[PDB]
Every structure is written in C-alpha cells, then in structure tokens.
Design a protein around this ligand. Structure first.
Ligand SMILES: CC(=O)N[C@H]1/C(=N/OC(=O)Nc2ccccc2)O[C@H](CO)[C@@H](O)[C@@H]1O
Ligand SMILES: *CCC(=O)Nc1nc(N2CCOCC2)c2ccsc2n1
Ligand SMILES: [Ca+2]
Length: 671
C-alpha cells in the first residue's frame, strides 16, 4: 500500500530483482538528498559500467534526457519506472526526485521490485504540520524524529510555533534565542533541509506589539537572526490576542513591510505566512470588515491561515468558499486535529476524516496542529500527508491502519486495539467529537437495553464484550513492554494502565451478571470497588497538567457500559437479597450530605456543575458561584466577597475537614 497514493500508477504483476550489478546514471547531477537514499538501498550491490541501468535526475540533467516527456509538469512531480532492463527516477525538480525515491523505497520488498510505471505530484502545494499548541513544546529529539517522518510521507512544511515558547511569543519574542536553543534550531533546519521540509519559524508578537518603528525593527532583527541560523520561511501569528495588535490595517502593513524589506531582499526565502486574529467563521465579525481588509491590503504572495467554520472543524466546500471570497486567495488551512490542549486527559488516536476531498484547488496549504505527544500524533500526521497529497483517493480507514503498521510494526494489532477505544474527546467547549468503539457499540447497546428493562440478552453479545475486554488486556500488556518505539510507549503508558484497569473492571462486572451465588457476587463486587480506587489513583497521579489533569480512556462507549451495568446489577442484588450495596461507579474519598458527585482535581475539591474530607488539610480558598469546621462540632463562619456572581474568600491555612452552607463550588487545600 503506497502512501500517499500516487496520482497515476500502472502495475504489471511481474517482479524484478534489485540489480546485484547495476550502473548508476546521474549520481553527480541529481538531488544529493535523493542519491543518498538511493545508495543506501543499493549498498552491498556492485556499481559497474555494464549492469542494469538506473537513471536518476531532475528535468534538465543529462541523465534523464530520454524521459523528458514522462516527467509531469508540476511542482514536486516525478516519474518512476521499473521494468526488465532499466529503472528511472526522474523529478520535475530536486524535491520531485527525492519524492521519487520515497515511493521507490516502499516498492522495494524482500529485495524484489514490481514492474511499474508511476507519474505523481501533489494536489496541495504546502502540506505538513504546525506545532502551534498550548502546553509542553515538543522535545528536540521528538522534532528530529518528526522531520524524518515528514520526508518519508512527502510533507514539505513544518511550522514552528509552540504557544509556550517564550522566544516565540510573549514577552521575549524580541530576544534572540540563547546559544543552546539556537544551536538546536540550527540542527533542526539542517535536518529539515535533508528531508526536503521547509522549516517555517513563526512569531507571535501581537499581544504587546506597539505599532511604532521600535518593535517593527526588533521583529525584523529577530527574523534576521533566525535567517542566520538557516531559516528560510517565516510566519507571523496574530491569533488569541486582544488590544491594538488586532488591527487588520496594521497587520497587513507589517507583513507587506516584511515582504518588501526582507523576503524580497533575500535570495532564497520561500514561504511567508500570517495567521489572522479572526481565523474561523464563527468568531469573525459580521458587522466589521476584518477579513476583507486583510484580503485587499495583504500582498498576493502572502498566505493567510484559517481553521474552518469553527476553531475545531472539518473543512467543507461551502466553508472554504466563504473564506476565499473575503481574503481574495486560497486559504492556508490550519486544522486543529489531533491537538488536545483543551482536553489534555484524552489521547486522540482515531482516523482523520470529515474534510471534503474535492477542494484541493481551493486551498493553498493544509497543516495539522498535533498533540503535545509527538509520536502519538504520527497516526493523524501520516493520514493528513496522504489526504493532502492525493485527496481524490484518500481512504480514511485504510490510511489509519497503514499509519499504525508504520509506527509500530511489531505490535500493530495491539496498537490498533488501543487506538480504536481512544478516539473521542469527551464533552468540551468546542462541541467537537469523534467516533470511538464503533464495532462493539451495537452489541453493547443491545446488551444494556435488554438488561435494564428485564428482557433477555443475546449470549453472542455477551461473549463479544468478554472478547473485547480480554483483547484489551492483551494489548495493554504487550504495548507496555514494547521496545520498538520507546518514545511512543512513554507517551501512552498512563493511558495504557487506565486502559487495562477498564478491561479488568469490565470482566469482573460481567461475572457479576452471570451471578451464580451470593458470596461469589460479593467477591466480584469487592474486586470492582478496588479497581475503581486504582483508577482514581492513576487519575490523580498521572498526567497532572494544570488544565485537564488525569487520564481518561474508552470514554464514549465502554466506560459508560461498564458503569451502567454495574449500577444496574447492584440494584437488582439489593432488591433480591434486601441489601444496601453502594452503586456508585467513581471512587471518591470525600463525602457530601445532592446526586452531584464530588471531583478531585489537583488540590481542589469541587461539586459537579455539607462536605467532609478524608482528613484535615490547611485551607487555601473557596470559590462559589451563585462556614467551616475541623471536627463537625465547632464551626468558624467566614465571609465572602463578590464581583459578577464570583464569590470567594481565603482560609489562610486554617485546618479544615468540614464545609457547610445554607440560606462553581470549589475548595482549594494545601498539598
Ligand atoms: C489558530 C489556533 O488554533 N490557535 C490556538 C487555538 N485557539 O483556540 C482557542 O481555544 N481560542 C481561544 C479560546 C478561548 C479564548 C481565546 C482564544 O486552538 C488550538 C486548539 O485549542 C490551539 O492549539 C491553537 O494554538
Ligand atoms: C491549564 C492551562 C491552560 O488552560 N492553558 C491554555 N490556555 C489557552 N489560552 C490562554 C491565552 O488566551 C487564549 C486561551 C488555550 C487556548 C486553546 S487551548 C489553551 N490552553
Ligand atoms: Ca540536477
């Protein structure tokens, strides 16, 4: 399965052996990056002057003169041919020759090649990744690995813009990088060049930019220093800011000044990109004229970025036409998937889908904003590479499977099993959701409905759930010990542990359904209660980021199933044996005398939108939005302050175990 799929492919069902004795033509004329790949594949084979002919070169080189007519007349296009007597690897330009070898490398298997002819080129001019998320920026090693990944998948763009890089954004975007960070960026650029990737360095100055000569000159001085480090593509982001930086007339003038005094003065600058302050339809001004101002003032060579109809959205034909009408050029798509910086307790490992596949001519570029987990993002990145290169033939599910088999061949099935149940985002402010657990959902929904209303469940559906849980446990244990992609495993391990505990809980709950006798049921009940507590421990000790801490997995279908089956069967037990077992499904060490479950997040205890803690803690503050004690007997009332329904008051380290109130709701304690 060639990825991305070529534009034109003719196979003959007739295999050739990689020439043991070959004759290379064009080694000095062709792209050095391509020739190096070629000679890696040919090492061990002899280079003579009367063997099989292998011709490599760009349009214009002597080596591929005979094949001029076969080379497509497109940027980054190429022509590949394998048959009995010769091999031809001929790009329209140097990058086309490199991409010819990346396809050649996939055809080579077991030392054999198929007799084939390919004419290929991209449907979208700029294709790649923008590291533009909030959170821990990608490590240096992760970025080196990404750049090699892009080259293999014909992605030609890496836009560097981590929101939390202080020399990229507020306040030190005026400062050059320190020597150590500068030497790393220098290495990234060299590696990006080796893989035919345009390293685009972006700057995010709009929050405190002043529209005067001082800051303008400092922005250009920063760009000049990046240029000295090898950067040849540049971007200016004006997203997620307020104040004077949001002025469209000023933004355009600044980028036109950069164009004329910098990008037009250098001999070798490629991409110049800007991200508007209004970067999606929902948040644009209907009264105002922000986008039309940018469209008319910005020089035509400058790209404008756009995330679609909303911050998180799929790109449609109606949405791309809406924006292009206003910016007077094809939009440079910034696709906010699989980025998870607003649902950081979730991994988004599902397939890439939703984007119209007939609008290649309507977009100038397409970049994906990934997760801060670099390797885990390779599933979607690989799929975006396929989509952007050949939208007409984009196969969502087949490309998802191909990505997984490339990222972890030694345990692809195990990773597919894990990814299938780690795709949805759970409820979020954007209302953006993805499918998850689709294969087992029919059985789960029929099993639970028959269960709640006293019918009979199909034994086949029951064994499907047993099969699923068993397979989940196999995949978790195999993935935990996989040493083929250690960075990947480190990223996902907290979720893999939570994944396994879910599976184990599911099996014990199903054993509670089979029932048998009273003591066995109680054994299973106690084991489930212990597994709940173990999942709480992980949720409180792993991935303790300051936004959505903890670890959530299989949230769309499987976890709801298990929790509602446990609740139901415990209810039937209490009715049958006149018991009072606890039917709650999430462990909580604190207690409130409402049906709203308390939640623990970092050092906060909150009521879901009188309390007794499991111990005494020093108090920080309370935040209610519409009295305290240590032993339950003696209380010490406290007063509140107010703004727009924001109640609050500091406790000043006073011991607290009890809280009460009578006439959203959070208690912060010291840890
Ligand atoms: C263009 C863009 O997507 N900007 C940021 C981004 N901004 O979206 C917002 O959340 N915008 C916003 C929301 C509330 C208040 C102000 C800005 O979306 C991505 C996913 O969150 C972030 O990674 C990007 O850095
Ligand atoms: C947990 C810390 C957190 O929420 N970080 C975060 N901040 C964002 N910004 C802050 C600046 O103004 C815009 C909102 C943000 C946007 C999208 S995801 C994200 N995370
Ligand atoms: Ca050449």
């Amino acid at each position: 399965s060639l990825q991305p799929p070529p534009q034109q492919l003719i196979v003959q069902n007739k295999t050739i052996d990689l020439p043991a004795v070959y004759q290379l033509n064009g080694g000095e004329e062709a792209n050095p990056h391509a020739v190096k790949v070629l000679k890696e594949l040919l090492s061990g084979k002899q280079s003579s002057k009367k063997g099989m002919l292998i011709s490599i070169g760009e349009k214009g080189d002597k080596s591929v003169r005979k094949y001029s007519r076969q080379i497509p007349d497109h940027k980054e296009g190429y022509y590949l041919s394998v048959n009995e007597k010769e091999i031809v690897l001929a790009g329209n330009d140097e990058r086309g020759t490199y991409y010819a070898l990346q396809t050649f490398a996939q055809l080579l298997k077991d030392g054999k090649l198929p007799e084939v002819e390919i004419k290929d080129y991209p449907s979208v001019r700029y294709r790649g990744v923008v590291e533009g998320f909030y959170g821990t920026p990608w490590s240096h090693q992760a970025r080196l690995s990404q750049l090699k990944f892009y080259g293999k998948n014909k992605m030609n763009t890496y836009i560097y813009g981590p929101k939390d890089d202080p020399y990229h954004s507020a306040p030190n975007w005026r400062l050059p990088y320190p020597d150590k960070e500068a030497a790393q960026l220098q290495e990234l650029v060299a590696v990006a060049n080796e893989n035919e990737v345009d390293f685009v360095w972006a700057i995010h100055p709009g929050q405190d930019i002043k529209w005067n000569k001082e800051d303008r000159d400092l922005l250009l001085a920063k760009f000049e220093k990046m240029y000295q480090l090898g950067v040849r593509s540049f971007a200016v982001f004006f997203d997620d800011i307020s104040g004077e930086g949001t002025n469209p007339q000023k933004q355009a003038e600044l980028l036109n000044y950069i164009d004329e005094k910098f990008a037009q003065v250098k001999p070798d600058i490629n991409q110049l990109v800007m991200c508007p302050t209004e970067y999606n339809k929902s948040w644009s001004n209907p009264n105002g004229n922000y986008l039309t101002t940018l469209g008319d003032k910005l020089n035509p060579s400058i790209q404008i970025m756009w995330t679609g109809d909303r911050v998180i959205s799929d790109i449609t034909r109606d949405g791309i036409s809406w924006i292009n009408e206003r910016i007077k050029r094809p939009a440079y798509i910034w696709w906010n998937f699989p980025v998870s910086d607003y649902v950081r307790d979730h991994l988004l490992l599902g397939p890439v889908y939703g984007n119209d596949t007939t609008i290649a001519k309507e977009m100038s570029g397409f970049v994906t904003n990934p997760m801060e987990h670099a390797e885990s993002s390779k599933i979607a990145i690989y799929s975006v590479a396929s989509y952007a290169w050949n939208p007409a033939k984009y196969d969502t599910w087949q490309t998802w499977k191909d990505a997984i088999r490339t990222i972890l061949p030694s345990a692809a099935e195990e990773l597919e099993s894990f990814a299938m149940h780690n795709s949805d985002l759970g409820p979020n402010g954007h209302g953006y959701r993805r499918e998850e657990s689709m294969d087992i959902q029919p059985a789960a929904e029929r099993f639970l409905k028959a269960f709640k209303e006293g019918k009979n469940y199909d034994k086949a559906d029951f064994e499907t759930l047993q099969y699923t849980f068993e397979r989940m446990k196999e995949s978790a244990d195999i993935l935990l010990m996989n040493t083929e992609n250690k960075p990947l495993i480190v990223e996902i391990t907290p979720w893999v542990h939570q994944f396994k505990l879910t599976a184990e809980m599911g099996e014990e709950v199903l054993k509670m359904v089979e029932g048998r006798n009273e003591s066995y049921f109680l054994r299973k009940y106690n084991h489930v209660k212990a597994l709940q507590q173990q999942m709480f421990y992980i949720d409180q000790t792993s991935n303790q980021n300051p936004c959505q801490p903890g670890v959530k997995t299989a949230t769309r279908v499987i976890k709801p199933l298990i929790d509602r089956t446990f609740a139901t069967v415990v209810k039937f037990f209490n009715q049958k044996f006149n018991a009072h077992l606890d039917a709650t499904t999430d462990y909580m060490p604190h207690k409130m005398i409402k049906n709203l479950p308390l939640q623990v997040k970092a050092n906060r205890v909150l009521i879901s939108p009188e309390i007794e803690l499991d111990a005494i803690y020093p108090g920080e503050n309370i935040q209610i939005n519409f009295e305290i004690s240590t032993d339950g007997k003696e209380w010490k009332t406290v007063d509140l302050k107010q703004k727009e329904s924001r109640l609050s008051a500091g406790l000043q380290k006073a011991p607290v175990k009890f809280v009460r109130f009578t006439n959203q709701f959070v208690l912060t304690i010291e840890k």
